[PDB]
């Protein structure tokens, strides 16, 4: 009377992931242990994440990094979807930091290099694992880091930003807690910086029971540096925990940092213009001005957000459809700018895009 999927006998629940329970699986014959994420088909469609799971499975299937949990196979049934992945005995890195204290400089450095190697592999593969925390970093029998919950991860697409505020407030970046738009990698660097602090101190750099003061502390970027902390790592933490994403460290900046470089194993790494047009009018006036000009050019469109437009044009020569995306952003407390983005599908696609923009610019403000 044992529950079986594949040839693994399903056992104890390891935890409850982003979209389902994760149970241990022990092979009938070999005794090999796996972790099985159970996704109920009817539940994943309820909280419309069918696309999220489709992508998540697609990515994790082609990944292969020694510090990211391997997805061995996906077993599908009429009722549920079973994600069979590699099992690690050591459990949460968080629990390790709870039971034992803070890790020593050498220990912390080792684990941080491993975690960052994985965070890098993800980014290199245009995948940004939002929700990066010690609770999601698992340890194996030999104390090796293993990134695990890709439920809140997302794709990095050429020319687009992400909005979704994902992780735990303590690990979330200021722009994430501020619900502002982000590129992706910077928010993982911030989270990794908090993971590094957790490793060296055994506590959180930004933590308060009073949620508003916690959010202020994060956006102010001010955190305590204990006396035992080596100035060189304080330097790295300062560079990683920058409230300005443009002033914040990149994997390359970290890779180049003298504290990170130390004892770093070989195997870990493989080595007068203006944007659009700015108009000081009211946001909806700008939207009325653009729509009346788009139709004036006889271009087709679809209104996504009240400030997002997906415009199409029929070429009178090549008889080809050329499409672009228009988005209005707020610059100052006084000005707003309209952004033009070409959407990928004869003559030149790129030049056809410029002519499309130029026409609309001629009938518009600054």
């Amino acid at each position: 009377g044992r529950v079986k999927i594949g040839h693994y006998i399903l056992g104890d629940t390891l935890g409850v992931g982003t979209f389902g329970k994760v149970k241990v699986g022990k092979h009938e014959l070999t005794g090999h242990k796996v972790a099985v994420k159970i996704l109920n088909r009817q539940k994943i469609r309820s909280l419309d994440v069918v696309g999220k799971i489709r992508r998540e499975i697609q990515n994790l299937k082609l990944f292969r990094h020694p510090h990211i949990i391997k997805l061995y196979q996906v077993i599908s049934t009429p009722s549920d979807i079973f994600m069979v992945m590699e099992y690690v005995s050591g459990g949460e890195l968080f629990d390790y930091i709870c039971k034992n204290g803070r890790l020593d400089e050498k220990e912390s450095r080792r684990l941080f290099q491993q975690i960052l190697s994985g965070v890098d592999y993800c980014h290199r593969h245009m995948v940004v694992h939002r929700d990066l925390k010690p609770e999601n970093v698992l340890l194996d029998a030999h104390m090796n880091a293993k990134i695990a919950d890709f439920g809140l991860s997302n794709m990095m697409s050429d020319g687009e930003f992400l909005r979704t505020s994902c992780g735990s407030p303590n690990y979330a970046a200021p722009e994430v807690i501020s619900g502002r738009l982000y590129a992706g990698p910077e928010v993982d660097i911030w989270s990794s910086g908090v993971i590094l602090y957790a490793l060296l101190c055994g506590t959180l750099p930004f933590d308060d029971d009073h949620v508003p003061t916690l959010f202020k502390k994060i956006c102010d970027g001010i955190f305590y540096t204990p006396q035992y902390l080596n100035p060189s790592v304080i330097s790295l933490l300062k560079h990683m925990l920058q409230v300005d994403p443009m002033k914040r460290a990149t994997i390359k900046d970290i890779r180049e940092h003298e504290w990170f470089k130390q004892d770093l194993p070989k195997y870990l790494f493989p080595e007068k213009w203006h944007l659009g047009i700015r108009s000081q009018s009211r946001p909806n006036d700008i939207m009325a001005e653009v729509c009346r000009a788009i139709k004036q050019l006889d271009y087709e469109w679809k209104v996504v957000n009240p400030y997002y437009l997906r415009v199409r044009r029929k070429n009178p020569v090549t008889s080809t459809f050329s499409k672009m995306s228009l988005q209005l952003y707020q610059v100052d407390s006084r000005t707003y700018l309209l952004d033009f983005r070409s959407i990928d599908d004869p003559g030149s696609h790129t030049i056809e895009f410029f002519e499309m923009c130029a026409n609309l610019i001629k009938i518009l403000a600054q």
């Binding site: 070429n315 009178p316 020569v317 003559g347 030149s348 696609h349 030049i351």
Partner: protein, 283 residues
């Protein structure tokens, strides 16, 4: 046949740099603004887009400037009225009257040998790399770049004896020769550079098609009466026939020049060996 096979394998895409800049002019653009744009953007050639035709019709180079200048110059006392007020299409209609020429281009997926042969076949120095799926121009393939990659593979894996290039009926200028006259020679002979000779046959300097953009840059094009030397005051590699072809190819890329002048024992001109000839022999 050793290097010849190597070119037939490698795709054009392999030579496109990681991050490039491409300048494109709409045919309706005023031609003076177009040359000044080449100068300001630091680009030697720029493809042309016909808005009505919705396709790349041709390319604007320094030869176009040499052609306008010589064809329409009157004196330093009068403006080159046409150059001042002429569109790229208006001039391309005059330049290519009955004698019409279409656009020569290569796909990034096409081989290096396909591109080298296309340079000599159409008698051209600048070749646009256009992706057929997108229709977008990506990079402009030059002899200097192709011979740079082939020099890296030559290292890892005589001039009179082999006899490579043109050595007879050489087009040259004197120290005192006016710019207008030199521009005329560049037109009738269809050559990239004119070697500057002294009182005797000895070579002192070299005025090239490139040195003509300085007239556009410094806005000194209205006076073509000035001597070739006077024009070259805004800023000479010579080879002998007792030197090996591999050492001749090595000396060229070491200074990154478009051609080498064949000089005798008494510094006098005997012939010329250009990047067009080296790549012709290795095909």
């Amino acid at each position: 046949s050793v290097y010849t096979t190597f070119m037939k394998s490698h795709r054009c895409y392999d030579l496109i740099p990681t991050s490039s800049k491409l300048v494109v002019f709409d045919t309706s653009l005023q031609v003076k603004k177009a040359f000044f744009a080449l100068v300001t953007n630091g680009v030697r050639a720029a493809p042309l887009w016909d808005s009505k035709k919705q396709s790349f019709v041709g390319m604007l180079t320094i030869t176009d400037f040499i052609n306008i200048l010589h064809r329409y110059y009157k004196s330093a006392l009068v403006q080159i009225y046409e150059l001042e007020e002429h569109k790229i299409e208006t001039w391309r209609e005059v330049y290519l009257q009955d004698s019409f020429k279409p656009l020569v281009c290569i796909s990034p997926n096409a081989s290096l040998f396909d591109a080298v042969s296309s340079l000599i076949r159409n008698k051209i120095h600048r070749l646009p790399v256009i992706d057929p799926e997108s229709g977008n121009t990506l990079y402009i393939l030059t002899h200097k770049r192709i011979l740079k990659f082939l020099k890296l593979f030559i290292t890892e894996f005589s001039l009179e004896e082999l006899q490579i290039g043109t050595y007879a009926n050489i087009a040259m200028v004197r120290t005192t020769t006016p710019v207008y006259v030199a521009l005329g020679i560049f037109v009738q002979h269809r050559v990239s550079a004119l070697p500057v000779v002294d009182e005797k046959g000895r070579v002192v300097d070299i005025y090239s098609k490139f040195d003509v953009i300085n007239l556009a840059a410094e806005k000194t094009y209205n006076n073509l009466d000035v001597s070739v030397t006077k024009a070259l005051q805004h800023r000479v590699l010579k080879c002998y026939l007792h030197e090996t072809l591999e050492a001749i190819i090595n000396r060229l890329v070491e200074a990154e020049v478009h051609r080498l002048v064949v000089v005798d024992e008494h510094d006098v001109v005997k012939g010329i060996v250009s990047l067009s000839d080296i790549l012709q022999a290795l095909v």
